[model samples]
Target: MQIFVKTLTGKTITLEVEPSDTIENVKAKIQDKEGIPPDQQRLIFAGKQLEDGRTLSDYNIQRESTLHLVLRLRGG
Candidate 1:
């Protein structure tokens, strides 16, 4: 399945994902894909933010679902 994420700067990326994969695992992929720190990645689905400890399967996230990314602003 695929998950779509939109970043703080309005950048979007798609991931080929497994439901069994941890959110942390997905963050690592996002970090690698876009150079955003994993800790700066917040996943939002169904209006609630998701924690990294849980797997996608645990939340029963849908195939057609979208994850909104809230990034920690960089620079001083």
Candidate 2:
């Protein structure tokens, strides 16, 4: 199956993963595909940080579902 993800920068990324893939797996894949580090990446669905070790389906995400991934930035 494929999962569609959208970044805060308006970049769309797609990952081909199984239903068994954990939230952490998705985070890692997004980081890899979008060049965002784990520490800097925050996966938010319905304005909540997605907990690790949970499957996308656990969040009610199905095939072709789009997730918003926001990258945290540091400021002075």
Candidate 3:
């Protein structure tokens, strides 16, 4: 299955993934795909933010789902 990572900067990243993959794994893929730091990446799916330790299967995320990416700010 595939997932779409849509960024706030109007960038969209496509990743080939399985439901068993963890959210952090997705971040790592994004990092390698776009050179974005994993720690700085925040993902949202179906209005709920993704948790690093959680797997895609846990959320029952649908294939080809569009996940919104919010870059983490350095500080508040």
Q: Over the stretch 31-50, how does candidate 3's per-residue lDDT look in tens digits? A: 89788888888889889989
Candidate 1 ranges with C-alpha deviation above 4 Å: 74-76
**What does candidate 1's lDDT look like per residue over 13-70, in tens digits?**
8988898988899888888878878887778887888888998888877665678888
- Total clashes, candidate 1? 0
Tens-place lDDT digits, model 2, residues 1-76: 9878886668787899787788888888977877677767678777778878788878877788787887778511
TM-score of each: 0.83, 0.81, 0.90
Estimate the TM-score for candidate 3: 0.90
The Cα local distance difference test for each model comes to: 0.82, 0.79, 0.88
| Order of quality (lDDT) | 3, 1, 2
For candidate 3, list the clashing residue pairs, or say none.
none
Lowest summed lDDT across 10 adjacent residues in model 1 is found at 67-76
Instruction: Score candidate 1 by lDDT.
Output: 0.82
Count of steric clashes across candidates, in order: 0, 0, 0
Clashing pairs in 2: none
Task: Give the poorly placed runs of model 2, Cα more than 4 Å off.
Answer: 74-76
| Selected candidate, larger lDDT, 1 vs 3 | 3
Residue range with the least summed lDDT across 10 consecutive positions in model 3: 67-76
